[PDB]
């Protein structure tokens, strides 16, 4: 934000706007600014759009560093302590709506994290320890799955009676589902098999298929029953909109 005529204003993917420069600057490469959270902070870049960082200071003895990506679509709005090494915020938004905001502890170690997917679905971790473990939950449209986290993966659990469903997401985005029932009678014990190819879990009881639980790309879950003998799917897959519908499929 330098001038109306000079210092062009470009639309920044992250609900922000950085104003470049017209011709150029005094000693070096282009310059630019942008007002962030009622406390505009200026900085100087190299190119003519927003491909550069924006330094600054806080309203309460701290710092701020808007490290705008080189492609104009990945605001990395940092907010260091006051020295410029210890952090207290790090909400990295993106063009397609992606967004991963973090909060740290009294030593720059990440404490909390909240990943928001393009489609709005969220994945929030809290109480993150040094090892990488912590409380976790996923916000889907209509309900919320709770679970835990480890440097290895995230595990959302849904319990219904003696059956316990587990949705794992590798710290790489890979989804896989498991199902266990402590019941020992073949007549009633529920068991399942995950098909990574079709991304679906097929529940079986006493050798018979009962239902297909599909974990879609759009972060949703659908349920379809088989015919009475378990020889083929029947009807139409139905979208799960409530936590209870899930606990229902597990009965």
């Amino acid at each position, epitope marked *: 934000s330098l001038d109306e005529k000079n210092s062009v204003s470009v639309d920044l993917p992250g609900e922000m706007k950085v104003l470049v420069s017209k011709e150029k600057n005094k000693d070096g490469k282009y310059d630019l600014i942008a007002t962030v959270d009622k406390l505009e902070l200026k900085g100087t870049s190299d190119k003519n759009n927003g491909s550069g960082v924006l330094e600054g200071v806080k309203a309460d003895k701290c710092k701020v560093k808007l490290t705008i990506s080189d492609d104009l679509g990945q605001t990395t709005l940092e907010v260091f302590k006051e020295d410029g090494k210890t952090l207290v915020s790090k909400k990295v938004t993106s063009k397609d709506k992606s967004s991963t905001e973090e909060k740290f502890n009294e030593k720059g170690e990440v404490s909390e994290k909240i990943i928001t997917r393009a489609d709005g679905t969220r994945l929030e971790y809290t109480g993150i320890k040094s090892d990488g473990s912590g409380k976790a939950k996923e916000v889907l449209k209509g309900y919320v799955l709770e679970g835990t986290l480890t440097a290895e993966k995230t595990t959302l659990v849904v319990k219904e009676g003696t059956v316990t469903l587990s949705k794992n997401i590798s710290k790489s985005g890979e989804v896989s589902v498991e199902l266990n029932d402590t019941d020992s009678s073949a007549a009633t014990k529920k068991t399942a098999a995950w098909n990574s190819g079709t991304s679906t879990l097929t529940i079986t009881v006493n*050798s018979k298929k009962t239902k297909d639980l599909v974990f879609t790309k759009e972060n949703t879950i659908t349920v379809q029953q088989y015919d009475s003998n378990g*020889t083929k799917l029947e009807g139409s897959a139905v979208e799960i909109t409530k936590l209870d519908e899930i606990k229902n499929a597990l009965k």
Partner: antibody
Amino acid sequence: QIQLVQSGPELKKPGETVKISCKASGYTFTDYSMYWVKQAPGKGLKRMGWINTETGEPTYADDFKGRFALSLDTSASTAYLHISNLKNEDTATYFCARGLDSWGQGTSVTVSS
Amino acid sequence: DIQMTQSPSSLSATLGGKVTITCKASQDINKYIAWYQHKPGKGPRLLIHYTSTLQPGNPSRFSGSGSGRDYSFSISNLEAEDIAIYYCLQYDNLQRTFGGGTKVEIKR
């Protein structure tokens, strides 16, 4: 409780037909397929085929095409195994099964003159 | 259909000992194997389902394990009355198939 009881021991002459019955009680006949298994001396247990109890469609195993038939009487929760043109290779014991936890007591068939 | 090659086809063990029968499928069967005990003149009795779950009504001397295409079943602390023919069964498919069976005899 749940039980599959079958018809008694049969003694037939070569070329005849035998119809084995399997009555289901204690569960909803229509919720499980119903399998048939052949137990020949020297052989272990071999699946002959199974039948969809909801629709009656029978699906046979390769070694049992032709002379064999699977039918049902839903009104009586009973399945049937038909074997026509009996040959000595048919003298053995036959079982019906449902799910993983039910087997009839089996029925011995002797093909002799 | 999926083949189940079970082995050995016959065992002769001493009382109190442990016996292991294995079953190899021609393809992944996702843990859907069951093991039955077949004593003469009676119907096959379910012992283990879903590769390792003990069906209620049976002593824990019976157990199973495995995954993919490879499974095993055991009888530990072999009792005098355990003689019988044991069978694996895959039911991952509608065309369920049986292993050849294993005759368990007592060595005394």
